[PDB]
Nucleic acid binder design. Structure first.
Lengths: 148, 180, 260, 94, 83
RNA sequence: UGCAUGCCGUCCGUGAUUUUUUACUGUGACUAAAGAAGCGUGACUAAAGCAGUCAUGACUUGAAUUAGAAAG
RNA sequence: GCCAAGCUAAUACAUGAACCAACCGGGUGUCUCCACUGAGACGCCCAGCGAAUGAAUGACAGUAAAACCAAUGCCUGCAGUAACACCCAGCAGUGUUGACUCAAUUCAUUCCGCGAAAGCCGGCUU
């Protein structure tokens, strides 16, 4: 094959670790619909692999569907707050907290940094489902699993 | 000594962490190997649990694989040509994982002749082997020139070895243009 | 690197008094967990009264007079646990360690025939070098060639004299189990259904012989027979039936009046 | 137990022609050769009765290239003919 | 010589104490190979090969069981089609 | 070692098709002792303790039970 | 707190075990045979646990009737049909999890850590 200029925008060549793309007799186990070889996996907790993961061309280590990152621990929900960073977003969780002495509630919120794979295109104000993973940066502990 | 803890870092609020404990051995770091090209010289390091890490200081030979043929050979290293971190590493000829090197191509030529009967007993399994098999012009051009490009796949500062794989496909063209 | 155990921090089931010592014997690593075991010194000094103190317990144990699973044990900190067989041939005593209806450790007397086998729960299955399937047990045993139908929830009947497996009982909808942990420990029931929640704890719903309903986590049930009437092991006196607290107190008062 | 067919091993189909086997065979034998196991060879004598050619030689002697073994095949040629009649009907039936 | 006994040539030291019999002191000989020791070593090799032989037999029985259960399923299938 | 083989509603895996939470409330699970509540017990009573009671041993002795924020 | 010389133990340190003793695979040379390539010897290598790099396996689970070539299997043309050119005619066609680049297996090249303590007692020539 030739070099895809739409993808190779770095000083080092971008490739998937799991498979070898330069194979003369590729195996149908990891053969994509468009001929090429692509590695993808099924994560566990009743979630579906997006079609862009199986049939796309993006290279993303730290993607739960196309890399060695696994999902284990907590599953949470939140609303998208900011999308200014590259391949990572900020989400907000809003909740009510009870005070016993004054039998009443007060509004509180929390913020989390979440890695977003190129399979999704969330916008500010949208709702997402996220899952816990191993530490990926100084602050990132979650990965986007579905966009609603 | 060197530590790997997060205590000295700033908080995301910009505030300063007040440390109320001394440094612990369980969070240490060590000085880098800075492996160079030359006659073999290694140094053992006793790591946690009693196991040993082999710190390579100089290397000049390695085990390199031709992925298409699923074989491997032991060959001599000649030069360091490219490095994505910085070209000051190329100037000093430093060996690290994922750097591009040039290796001797003579052992690979000998294997090709003895396996396919092609120069670049009655039982002719060669005719069977050449059926539905072809070689890339980019590789054969280097095999005739004497040296062939390869990518280091091991971590010399952790295991003491410099192993790798030959460049083929679109990855070969990517680095050829970056060297042109 | 902890090697002590304060008496206030020791498990309540050991029944050690708070006023008669600062420390308790700390069990060593072994077949059973520290929080779910009963050290040999506690068995021989308390419970059975063959030893009056720790000095006499050491005399008995270090001679090799106590056998656990057909093997002499010489350590008073050896952790003994659920379904273990303890034999003292010089005295002529054989017991199995079980849970009574109140969740406490109980020693059940055994006949010579019944002392040759023990029930083993599978907890893991993996492949060893040379493609050998291995089954890991709740008491740390490693069986090198289990039956091809073995699953992680099943129970294995194991002959300890010949070191050979004899039978396999599967975890199904119509089987009898005993609870080994939680608030319902010691109760014997029958499986009604099992709820599967991937990634979290599965929940089992059980039915007692008297029709009472209760539930536990799937990791706390232990298969012991194909139905409530054909059990492959001997159970304690109460047969795993929880009794009403109001009713139980009334009978105890009546019995005291008649006894005197 | 006396049976018509007799089993011959370890003759090799690709190395020996058809003419070679009856050279060892006394006669009146129907030959069939198998390739799933090279050694296999079934010899159904016309009038075997007491298999003199099987009780004699067999394990004691050796065929060309390799030693040979013979055992009673416990197979009746009549049953094969019965299946042959049914099979031909099936071929006609389709 | 190689076959000569060495216990006879060990050096004895004489100790004299007043009003007591003489004391003769000789070392205990180390690395003295006796027929009791020779039999002990040879048993170790014999049981090591025995244990490995038993393990291979256990493997054959397991593979026999797997194959036998596998052939009964296809035999049962052929029985259904025949009837 | 074929020593073998036969005499409509469900179960389980995978694909296709489209959507309702949170909160409150009822149960249930999972949750160290010591401390608090309290069932039994004439340590001479009590503050205590978990023991002891009765005729080559028995009581197939006893040591019941509860509450503990919020979040999950 | 210390120096030099002379003696001497090991379960300290170092070295080191052929045949008994198997199954299975990869690469290659001389003999027999078939056909005009295929099979079997024979030789010759190399194949342990663990570690490193590379290549495969680590399943399937969206449609059905039939022709034509070359190579094969079984019947005397397509019935019958785990797989496999003999020694083994069933000596793995089947690891686990919610999920794995994990467990384990085969192939190529490379380490350059791995005693049967070369041990100690006891009971009856073993």
């Amino acid at each position: 094959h030739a070099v895809d200029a739409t993808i190779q925008h770095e000083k080092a060549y971008q490739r998937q670790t799991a498979v070898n793309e330069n194979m003369h007799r590729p195996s149908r186990k990891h053969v994509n619909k468009s001929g090429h070889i692509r590695y993808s996996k099924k994560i566990g907790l009743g979630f579906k692999t997006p079609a862009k993961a199986l049939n796309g061309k993006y290279i993303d280590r730290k993607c739960p569907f196309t890399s060695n990152v696994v999902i284990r621990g907590r599953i949470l929900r939140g609303v998208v707050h900011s999308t200014k960073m590259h391949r990572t977003i900020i989400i907000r969780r809003n909740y009510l907290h009870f005070i016993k002495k004054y039998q009443r509630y007060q509004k509180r919120h929390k913020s989390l940094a979440v890695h977003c794979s190129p399979a999704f295109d969330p916008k500010q104000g949208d709702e997402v489902v996220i899952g816990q993973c191993r530490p990926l940066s100084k602050t990132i502990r979650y990965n986007v699993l579905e966009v609603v | 000594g060197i530590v790997r803890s997060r205590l000295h870092k700033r908080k995301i609020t910009g505030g300063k962490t007040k440390i109320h404990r001394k440094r612990m051995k369980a969070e240490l770091g060590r000085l880098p190997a800075n492996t160079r090209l030359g006659a073999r010289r290694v140094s053992p390091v006793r790591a946690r649990g009693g196991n040993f890490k082999i710190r390579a200081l100089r290397l000049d030979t390695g085990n390199f694989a031709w992925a298409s043929e699923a074989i491997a050979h032991r060959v001599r290293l000649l030069d360091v040509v490219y490095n994505a971190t910085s070209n000051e590493l190329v100037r000093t000829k430093t060996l690290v994982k994922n750097c591009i090197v040039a290796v001797d191509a003579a052992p690979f030529k000998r294997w090709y002749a003895k396996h396919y009967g092609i120069d670049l007993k009655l039982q002719r399994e060669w005719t069977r082997r050449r059926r539905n098999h072809r070689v890339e012009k980019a590789i054969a051009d280097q095999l005739r020139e004497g040296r062939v490009l390869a990518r280091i796949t091991s971590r010399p500062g952790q295991s003491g070895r410099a192993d790798g794989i030959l460049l083929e496909g679109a990855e070969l063209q990517f680095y050829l243009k970056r060297l042109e | 690197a902890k090697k002590h155990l304060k008496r206030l921090y020791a498990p309540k089931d050991w029944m050690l008094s708070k006023l008669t010592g600062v420390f308790a014997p700390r069990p060593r690593p072994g077949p059973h967990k520290l929080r779910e075991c009963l050290p040999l010194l506690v068995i021989i000094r308390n419970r059975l009264k063959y030893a009056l103190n720790a000095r006499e317990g050491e005399m008995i144990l270090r001679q090799g007079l106590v056998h656990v699973d057909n093997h002499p044990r010489r350590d008073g900190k050896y952790p003994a646990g659920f379904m273990d067989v303890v034999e003292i041939p010089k005295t002529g005593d054989r017991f199995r360690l079980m849970y009574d209806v109140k969740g406490r450790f109980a020693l059940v007397n055994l006949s010579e025939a019944e002392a040759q086998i023990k029930l083993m729960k599978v907890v893991n299955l993996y492949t060893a070098t040379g493609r050998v399937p291995v089954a890991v047990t709740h008491d740390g045993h490693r069986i090198r060639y289990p039956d091809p139908h073995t699953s992680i929830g099943d129970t294995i009947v194991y002959n300890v004299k010949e070191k050979k497996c004899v039978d396999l009982i599967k975890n199904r909808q119509g089987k009898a189990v005993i609870v080994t942990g939680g608030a319902n420990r010691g109760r014997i029931g029958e499986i009604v259904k099992v709820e599967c929640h991937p990634g979290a704890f599965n929940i089992a719903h059980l039915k007692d012989a008297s029709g009472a309903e209760f539930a536990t986590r799937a990791a706390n049930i232990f298969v012991i027979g194909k139905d409530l009437n054909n059990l492959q092991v001997t159970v304690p006196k109460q047969q795993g039936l929880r009794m009403n607290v109001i009713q139980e107190r009334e009978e105890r008062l009546i019995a005291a009046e008649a006894r005197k | 137990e006396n049976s018509s067919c007799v089993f011959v091993s370890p003759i090799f189909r690709p190395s020996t022609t058809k003419a070679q086997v009856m050279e060892l065979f006394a006669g009146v034998k129907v030959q069939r050769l198998r390739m799933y196991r090279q050694n296999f060879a079934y010899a159904y004598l016309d009038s075997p009765a007491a298999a003199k050619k099987f009780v004699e030689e067999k394990n004691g002697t050796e065929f060309r290239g390799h030693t040979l073994r013979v055992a009673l095949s416990a197979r009746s040629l009549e049953k094969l003919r019965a299946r042959q009649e049914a099979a031909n009907v099936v071929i006609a039936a389709h | 010589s190689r076959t000569e006994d060495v216990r006879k040539y060990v050096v004895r030291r004489r100790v004299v104490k007043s009003g007591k019999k003489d004391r003769l002191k000789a070392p205990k000989i180390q690395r003295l190979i006796t027929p009791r020791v020779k039999a002990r070593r040879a048993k170790k090799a014999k049981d090591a090969i025995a244990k490995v032989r038993a393990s291979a037999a256990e493997r054959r029985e397991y593979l026999r069981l797997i194959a036998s259960n596998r052939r009964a399923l296809r035999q049962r299938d052929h029985s259904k089609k025949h009837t």
